Design an enzyme around this catalytic site. Structure first.
Site, PDB file in Angstrom:
ATOM      1  N   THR A 271       0.820  -1.205   0.000  1.00 19.13           N
ATOM      2  CA  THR A 271       0.000   0.000   0.000  1.00 19.13           C
ATOM      3  C   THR A 271       0.853   1.254   0.000  1.00 19.13           C
ATOM      4  O   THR A 271       0.349   2.343  -0.297  1.00 19.13           O
ATOM      5  CB  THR A 271      -0.914   0.017   1.218  1.00 19.13           C
ATOM      6  N   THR A 272       2.129   1.118   0.338  1.00 24.34           N
ATOM      7  CA  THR A 272       3.113   2.171   0.171  1.00 24.34           C
ATOM      8  C   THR A 272       3.109   2.712  -1.256  1.00 24.34           C
ATOM      9  O   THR A 272       3.574   3.829  -1.498  1.00 24.34           O
ATOM     10  CB  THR A 272       4.495   1.633   0.534  1.00 24.34           C
TER      11      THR A 272
ATOM     12  N   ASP B 245       4.878  -6.558   8.785  1.00 22.56           N
ATOM     13  CA  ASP B 245       5.076  -6.544   7.338  1.00 22.56           C
ATOM     14  C   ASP B 245       5.990  -7.680   6.904  1.00 22.56           C
ATOM     15  O   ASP B 245       5.708  -8.375   5.923  1.00 22.56           O
ATOM     16  CB  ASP B 245       5.649  -5.199   6.889  1.00 22.56           C
TER      17      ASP B 245
END
Lengths: 521, 479, 524, 451, 49
Positions: free
Chosen positions: B46-47, B347
């Site tokens: 989503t970065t 993550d």
């Protein structure tokens, strides 16, 4: 000549009332007219007092559901859409836009100082004739399996044009078909299960060859079982309170209390052994269970499933071949649920228990691994509508022709009737017929084609007698759907027209709108 | 990030950042839900993904001034998605769970975009070892995060964040006596060690003066004998489940346990007991009659341990149960670095989970985007019409993110775009953008990679989202 | 250190700086350019708007629209100023230049998000404008216009009236405008001052009545309404003084010390009156042209003298009468003589029938210099529309006084210049091709909006027309302006100015180069 | 709305031009815009509609001019047509209720015009009371002022001279003069000198030997006493319109110089005497030299009746003057409309493509007008319109809706003649305004000019 | 509303509900009546029903 209403109470007893009703109706009609045909584009219902809750939808049912109004006629039409969606599915759009066009006709007619009862009688007769003509054209199937299957495929494919899922129509329509096959001719709607799991693609979705459960398991239950003898129960199992009350423990020493505790443990073990006497490899509990029963079950080592759902347990009793029990004195008078394997499956980031090789497959479970919650919600709405249509077309095998075919058929029949009818009604009916002509027209407007050319060609074709003539939406031409495969439910269109007729009947017979003084807010 | 309330947050992952904002515009909500989906299916990326979606939106804007109808535009969207599937498939390669080095490269590249990225030296072993202890190196193809529970503790330093396969308890020994036994015996209790109470009301009525002393002595002997049956196995640790409406621990029994030198811990949450069953193999006991060694486990060493001068916490380690559960402690300056380390570890965990899930690695850096753009231009040239313009728009949209890669690395976007376009246009693939050197280079020697599923989900969900948005055309205000 | 007041009143003080300021600029300017889209050149619509005092005024003369707006942002006021400049320079493309500027800044905002200094974009725009104007001057064809041939000018004005409702008649206006320009032009000086033309309009009538009068119109009736109403060829005189006895412009106190002084003054009064009458009657001029009015005694005397005259006639109209009649200015009867008199062609009185207005026209048999244009139409909106349109037409002709003042327009020039810009830009190194290509795109923006306004399927239209005009090179293949096929503009012949488009290009390029530089902002 | 202002302005323009049909052009424009919004709701390029209506209007103009008929070759037929058109105008307004009493009367007034506009030359007088039937047009001329004492009370066969002079103060044209004396005897001398200068001026004027006098400005007390010493009638200050009317009707001159007693023409009349009109006094002027300007007497039950009577009769006078200017007329309302509709329809047969539907919408828009006429009457519309379309399709171009009843009949015998010029102008203006308002694309309201 | 071809009346109560009918009592009851003769006549039509 004197004030008689309360502060905030209004009465319009002139044409201003019908004016307000008509403009509200048109505001309804144009908002939804973009959600019809294979060319529709979706809308947003945005909120500000609902803590910013939004829903995107194409079938105008939710649209009329989420909007209120002061003009009572628009709410009347909202309830009409409610009814329409309560019957089968898509067509709320159709009936609402059709009502808008008919009220525009009424506008044009009132523009000539005509007593509306003439219009009412003429439309009564026109509707009678149109329904008779359509019934005479009612094409039926189901005498052959392949013919009936292809008819269902045509109906489903045509219906997915009106919503988004068309992008994978071949991977959706056909799939939905098998679902209604699993109904096995039962009239139940509440066997299909709807599952939403964001992440993945609409093509990544599938119809499993079994059933799934989304409840926690007991403290010590095996992960996998084969050839499961399945039983479903609904009792206490929560230290199984005696259900008798107004009875008290009243002693003078605690040794008796200790013996009472030991006795209740023994009685619970007795209940467990009563259940185990029947003999099962899988247990189901619709509700919770306590630690001591869990230890007893772990001693038995069987599958105990806790805190299920009433509708879900009804579905699963229909599915796996068992029925829910609450007393266990009879290892002989119960039928046991059956499955091949019961295993564990991880879907999305949620844990499910998988029924593989179930003895029966009545109910259905449709998993949607879509990509957003809003698309998931509209996808579940659309599949609900599609399965309702599928069930309805399985119910009554008679079908009809869309693409305006049946529509221009009734249009031309009413045309001929008006031609053989004297008086204003004729042109009114003709305009009424013209009203019907607007419906396919708007469809072409959604496509944005040569409108008048197409309408003229269809009227010429139907005057020639070509009763299978329709509109080609793939290119903008005129062809035969019997080649193309555009067939719909006879029940659907029949009730659409009848409901539109009665809605017009009630709306036109209004003369004075009186809004009561608001209470407060 | 700070809200209208007291708490504050610092983040470097686009997902949570998007989560913090709240916008009254439907498009923003749509993007937020798309980010949620990418998180649930992948966890990170989503970065970039929302920016990619905006790039496609501006790309289709020009086509929209060009007048192409939204339906054909959507069809081109679908076709571009379908083509990009195989375009990604092109430069992939099979992976192995036996070689650790590719795994560590994957994890570290995942953690390039975290605040603790410089601490990868210590953290790269941690998340990876967390992953192996959960599932098998053999056929698993299914990973659960709830197999892992991580504890948050303030104080300490990032260096103190450690992985152990044991069980950590936030509860404290109410007895200040025996607090460390090696090779101790472990027990769990579900019921309440208290005065015997009935399901209905119980009234021990008294009609004589001797009855008070009688019942007091009798209850003492009763609780005594129950705890004696408990000790009959020779246990050395007892866990008592949290209880409500009734005291799970008895003060008189507390003294009894103090006399018999067994650690006493109560008020244990209802759920993770199964975790404990998965952790140390212990099994619950719901009645003393049930009680048997079959629901008793074994341990090597458990103790209430100090935090170097920052409190005491309960630890259990050395059990022989081949459990599939782990835990990690986190320490640091303040709760903010705690959140940063937590999100980075999460993550890494989700990245490795997907990597084992769908074993297919794709090089990051610059080669993927430029290969997409080149192949998609040469595909657009092959399909003349309004289709060709839309596909060229696709091919030009994908270059937005690498332009950012150049920019935020202190580089001119256009020069780097030109260089990558030229280098990969000559058939020289694997041309990745170097953040350190500051240009285009072989991404293989740059150790920058990611799994196929990451980008696959990214672009697939982006395409479908864009298609739904263009299928959206009207808005009406509601309540 | 605790924050402290450095800048006076930082409380109500608002600052913006950086890329976000450019974002605000581009968004506002794109909104304005898209606001002003649907009136492009030869074919378009008209936008109607009301101002603060409640006046309805509609036109495609974009400068008026932008001027009559109470806009808020500064860049929009700058746009209004640019529109006024272009209108006062040529009078066409009053929306073309602003749409071009909007296109240029569209390109600028696209390339901006690519991370390049605005100096690069401004330099690229300047070079591209250089190339575009150079080729636009290479492609324009010289028009040999003389005093006896008018058909090219007639078609010029006819095409110019496109998208302007005055194209109803579309023919007679061109002829009357050309005739007026020829009559009033100063050929040697190449000068035409529009103060020499009394552009007038009266509601009612029809656009067919749009006429040119080779003379002057006056809006005052007879001093003696019973006096005979019309005269043929006559001789006029222009007196800048009333008929009152001469009193000095110094404060004067005339004593009257005797009754015979009273008799002397009451006799001298009339004696002066009839002396003035005899003076003016001797010179033989039929008409007297005064400015300040006079007394009724002169009225009745001229009734007994049958010599027509008017009074209270305003300054500029006095001057125009003098210019048309060929005479000179006579301050007082000392200068009065038969020589300096002005000869009249014919003078007549009309009242527009139903109306109660009175209005005298002077039509000259001999040579004239100041002409008058009259308008008949539907309302004051019609009158003002015709006035502004014909005025812009006069500006066009005045520009057209020279040769080579025309190139084929209708958008074809946009394709040609875009092609030349692309051809030149392609043979260049990097860092510049992007800005030049952006300018090229801004160039073909005009035909795209043209086809949109016509309602034609745009993208295919531009594609086919571009292919046709690329494979064979000509300045005449533009898109359908009359929408009847025949895109070869050597048939439709859109005949429009050269310097108009050149000035639009220059103004747009300079203005976007200017706006690109404002990167740091401050408001209260 | 700006379009609303545009409509009211087209209404004012049509009103100033002729009148009696401003309502018609407004309704026609609005109804055209009704079909316009309908057709654009059918997604049509506006330029196409504009071009189609332009060509259709050109064709309709040609056809209507072809239908125009000239008249005035004789007196009886032309006069009958004038009463016809007058009464037809009176139908549109309230004057219909007594239109006959108006009609012939109105005709006579337009007879007195004799080739000149400026209806201001026609005078109208209102007094509350009386009746509409009591209203009549004077057989002479009228004036409304007051007379002095030393002037006579009854006169006949007067000779009239008009003036616009300053006789109140004898202000000398030079400003700055002042008396510089010391003894007040000189003041008495100079004042007697001024009084005798005024006496000699009165002698200068009276040297013309007129029998009656009018001055546009105030007759001062000393002038009035000198006139009374002469003993003849003199009329005090009045307006410009009154003196112009008197100069017309008597053929005098507005004199401001009196050194030429015989070089001037004197106004002529036969009887000048007051008449006590109810509660009012008006002087009767019979036997005037020229019967050009006329005075109309109006009486009514309410002043609003008088106001609308004057408005409507002004409209009728405007129409009568316009038809005197050009004798080109057509047949009655709707019938000319309906034959133009027939011609446009015939073009629609000839009109291919998309412009055809626009111009046929134009056609039915035109056809809508008699429908509205029938609706205002209070009779069935569809039957009349279809039947009269059949009638005009057979070449019976003289039949039409009956004015007396809701039936159909020839207006040639019925007597409804329609002024061609007025309504061709109406059609042209309506077409222009409609195309202008349809050429819109954007409304942008500026600030409301914050108070 | 009189006649077999009557023209019904559709109206809203104070809470936001739509009611269509032709008889008198149901009309008069949920009609907001402020004057007192109005309420008397509501009673009257209700009795007739």
């Amino acid at each position: 000549p004197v004030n008689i209403f309360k502060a905030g109470a209004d009465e319009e007893r002139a044409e201003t009332a019908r004016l307000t009703s008509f403009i509200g109706a048109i505001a309804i009609g144009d908002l939804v007219k973009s959600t019809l045909g294979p060319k529709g584009m979706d809308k947003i219902l945005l909120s500000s007092g609902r803590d910013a809750s939004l829903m995107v939808t194409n079938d105008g049912a939710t649209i009329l559901k989420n909007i209120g109004v002061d003009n009572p006629a628009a709410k009347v039409l909202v309830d009409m859409s409610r009814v329409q969606d309560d019957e089968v599915g898509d067509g709320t759009t159709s009936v609402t836009v059709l009502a808008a066009e008919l009220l525009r006709e009424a506008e044009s007619l009132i523009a000539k100082k005509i007593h509306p009862q003439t219009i009412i009688a003429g439309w009564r007769e026109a509707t009678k004739a149109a329904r008779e003509a359509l019934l005479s054209s009612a094409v039926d199937h189901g005498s052959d399996e392949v013919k009936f299957r292809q008819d269902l495929m045509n109906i489903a494919g045509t219906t997915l044009s009106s919503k988004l899922l068309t992008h994978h129509k071949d991977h959706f329509t056909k799939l939905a078909v098998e679902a209604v096959l699993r109904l096995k001719g039962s009239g139940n709607l509440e066997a299909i299960h709807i599952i939403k799991k964001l992440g993945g693609s609409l093509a990544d979705s599938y119809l499993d060859e079994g059933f799934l459960l989304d409840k926690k398991i007991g403290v010590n239950q095996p992960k996998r079982i084969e050839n499961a003898k399945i039983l479903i129960a609904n009792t206490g199992m929560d230290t199984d309170k005696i259900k008798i009350f107004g009875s008290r423990v009243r002693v003078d020493s605690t040794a008796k209390v200790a013996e009472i505790e030991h006795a209740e443990k023994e009685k619970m073990k007795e209940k467990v052994e009563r259940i185990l006497k029947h003999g099962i490899n899988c247990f189901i509990n619709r509700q919770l269970i306590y630690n001591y029963p869990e230890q007893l079950f772990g001693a038995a080592g069987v599958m105990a499933i806790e805190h299920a759902d009433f509708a879900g347990v009804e579905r699963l009793a229909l599915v796996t071949g068992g029925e829910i029990a609450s007393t266990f004195d009879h290892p002989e008078l119960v039928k046991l649920g059956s499955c091949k394997l019961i295993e564990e499956v991880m879907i999305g980031e949620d844990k499910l228990i998988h029924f593989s090789g179930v003895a029966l497959g009545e109910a259905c479970t449709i998993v949607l691994r879509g990509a957003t919650q809003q698309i998931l919600d509209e996808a579940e709405r659309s599949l609900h509508d599609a399965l309702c249509v599928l069930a309805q077309t399985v119910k009554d095998s008679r079908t009809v022709y869309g693409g305006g075919c049946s529509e221009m058929l009734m249009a031309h029949a009413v045309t001929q009737l008006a031609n053989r009818t004297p008086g204003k009604e004729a042109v009114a009916m003709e305009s009424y017929a013209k009203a019907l002509r607007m419906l396919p027209t708007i469809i072409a407007d959604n496509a944005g084609y040569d409108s008048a050319d197409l309408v003229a060609q269809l009227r010429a074709a139907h005057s020639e007698g070509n009763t299978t003539a329709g509109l080609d939406m793939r290119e903008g031409t005129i062809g035969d759907m019997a080649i193309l495969g555009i067939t719909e439910s006879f029940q659907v269109k029949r009730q659409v027209l009848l409901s539109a007729a009665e809605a017009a009947e009630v709306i036109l017979r209004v003369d004075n709108i009186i809004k009561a003084a608001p209470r407060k807010r | 990030i700070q809200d209208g309330k007291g708490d504050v947050t610092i983040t470097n992952d686009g997902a949570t950042i998007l989560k913090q904002m709240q916008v009254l515009h439907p498009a923003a909500r749509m993007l937020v839900e798309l980010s949620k989906a990418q998180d649930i299916e992948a966890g990170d990326g989503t970065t970039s993904v929302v920016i990619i979606a905006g790039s496609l939106l501006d790309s289709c804007t020009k086509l929209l001034q060009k007048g192409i109808h939204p339906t054909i535009i959507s069809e081109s969207f679908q076709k571009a998605l379908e083509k990009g599937i195989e375009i990604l498939t092109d430069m992939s390669r099979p992976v192995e769970l036996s070689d650790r080095e590719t795994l560590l490269n994957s994890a570290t590249t995942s953690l390039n975009s975290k605040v603790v990225s410089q601490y990868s030296s210590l953290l790269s072993p941690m998340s990876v070892n967390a992953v192996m202890k959960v599932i098998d190196p053999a056929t698993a193809t299914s990973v659960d995060l709830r197999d892992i529970k991580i504890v948050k503790k303030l104080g300490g330093t990032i260096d103190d964040c450690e992985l152990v396969e044991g069980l950590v308890l936030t509860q404290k020994v109410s007895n200040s006596g025996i607090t460390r036994v090696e090779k101790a015996k472990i027990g769990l209790i579900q019921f309440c060690l208290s005065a015997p109470k009935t399901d209905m009301d119980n009234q021990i009525v008294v009609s004589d003066y001797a009855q008070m002393d009688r019942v007091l002595r009798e209850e003492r002997a009763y609780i005594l004998n129950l705890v004696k049956q408990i000790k009959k196995t020779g246990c050395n640790v007892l866990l008592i489940q949290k209880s409500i409406l009734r005291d799970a621990l008895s003060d008189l029994a507390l003294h009894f346990l103090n006399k018999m030198k067994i650690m006493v811990i109560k008020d244990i949450e209802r759920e993770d007991i199964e975790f404990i069953c998965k952790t140390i193999g212990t099994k619950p006991v719901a009645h003393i009659d049930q009680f048997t060694a079959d629901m008793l486990g074994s341990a090597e060493l458990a103790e209430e341990v100090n935090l170097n001068g920052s409190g005491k916490l309960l630890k259990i380690t050395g059990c022989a149960s081949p459990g599939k559960t782990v835990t990690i402690v986190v320490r640091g300056s303040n709760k903010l670095v705690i959140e940063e380390a937590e999100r980075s570890i999460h993550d890494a965990l989700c990245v490795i989970r997907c990597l084992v899930k769908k074993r297919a690695l794709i090089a990051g850096g610059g080669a993927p985007e430029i290969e997409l753009a080149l192949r998609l231009t040469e595909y657009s040239r092959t399909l003349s019409g309004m289709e060709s313009y839309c596909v060229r728009a696709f091919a030009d949209a994908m270059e937005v993110i690498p332009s950012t890669l150049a920019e935020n690395a202190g580089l001119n976007p256009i020069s780097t775009v030109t260089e990558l376009r030229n280098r990969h246009a000559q058939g020289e693939k694997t041309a990745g953008i170097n953040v350190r050197k500051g240009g285009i280079s072989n991404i293989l020697e740059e150790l920058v990679v990611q799994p196929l599923l990451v980008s696959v989900s990214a672009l697939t969900l982006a395409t479908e989202t864009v298609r739904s948005i263009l299928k959206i055309d009207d808005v009406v205000n509601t309540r | 250190g605790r924050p402290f007041l450095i800048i006076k009143d930082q409380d109500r003080k608002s600052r913006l700086m950086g890329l976000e300021a450019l974002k605000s600029h581009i968004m506002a300017a794109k909104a304005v350019a898209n606001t002003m889209r649907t009136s492009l050149g030869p074919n378009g619509l008209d936008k109607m708007m009301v101002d603060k005092d409640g006046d309805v005024t509609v036109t495609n003369d974009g400068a008026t629209i932008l001027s009559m707006m109470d806009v808020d942002h500064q860049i929009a006021k700058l746009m209004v100023e640019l529109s006024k400049s272009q209108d006062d320079e040529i009078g066409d493309g009053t929306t073309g230049v602003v749409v071009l500027a909007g296109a240029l800044l569209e390109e600028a905002e696209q390339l901006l998000d690519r991370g390049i200094h605005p100096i690069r974009i401004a330099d690229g725009y300047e070079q591209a404008a250089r190339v575009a104007i150079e080729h636009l001057d290479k492609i324009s064809d010289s028009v040999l216009v003389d005093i006896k041939d008018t058909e090219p000018l007639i078609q010029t004005a006819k095409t110019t009236l496109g998208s302007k409702v005055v194209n109803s008649c579309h023919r007679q206006m061109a002829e009357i405008a050309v005739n007026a320009v020829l009559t009033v032009a100063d050929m040697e000086r190449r000068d035409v001052d529009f103060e020499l033309i009394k552009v007038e309009g009266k509601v009612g009538g029809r656009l067919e009545d749009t006429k040119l009068i080779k003379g002057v119109i006056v809006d005052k009736d007879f001093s003696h309404p019973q006096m005979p109403k019309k005269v043929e060829d006559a001789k006029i005189a222009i007196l800048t003084c009333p008929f009152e006895p001469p009193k000095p412009k110094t404060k004067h106190k005339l004593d009257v010390t005797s009754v015979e002084d009273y008799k002397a003054l009451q006799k001298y009064e009339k004696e002066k009156f009839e002396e003035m009458i005899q003076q003016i009657k001797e010179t033989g001029a039929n008409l007297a042209i005064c400015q300040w009015g006079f007394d009724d005694e002169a009225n009745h005397l001229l009734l007994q003298n049958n010599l027509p005259a008017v009074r209270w006639v305003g300054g500029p109209e006095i001057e125009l009468i003098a210019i048309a009649t060929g005479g000179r200015i006579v301050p007082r009867f000392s200068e009065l003589t038969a020589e300096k008199l002005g000869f009249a062609g014919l003078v007549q009185e009309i009242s527009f029938g139903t109306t109660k207005d009175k209005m005298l026209v002077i039509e000259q048999c001999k040579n004239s210099r100041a002409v008058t244009i009259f308008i008949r139409g539907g309302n004051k909106m019609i009158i003002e529309e015709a006035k502004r349109s014909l005025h812009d037409a006069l500006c066009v002709i005045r520009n057209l006084i020279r040769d080579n003042r025309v190139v084929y327009g209708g958008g074809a020039a946009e394709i040609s210049c875009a092609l030349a810009v692309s051809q030149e830009a392609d043979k260049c190194p990097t860092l510049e091709q992007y800005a030049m290509r952006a300018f090229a795109d801004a160039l073909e923006v005009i035909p795209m909006a043209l086809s949109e306004n016509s309602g034609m399927n745009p993208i295919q239209t531009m594609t086919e027309v571009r292919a046709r005009q690329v494979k064979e090179m000509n300045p005449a293949l533009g898109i359908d302006c009359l929408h009847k096929g025949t895109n070869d503009m050597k048939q439709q012949h859109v005949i429009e100015t050269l310097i108009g488009k050149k000035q639009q290009i220059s103004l747009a390029t300079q203005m976007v180069r200017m706006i690109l530089k404002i990167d740091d902002i401050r408001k209260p």
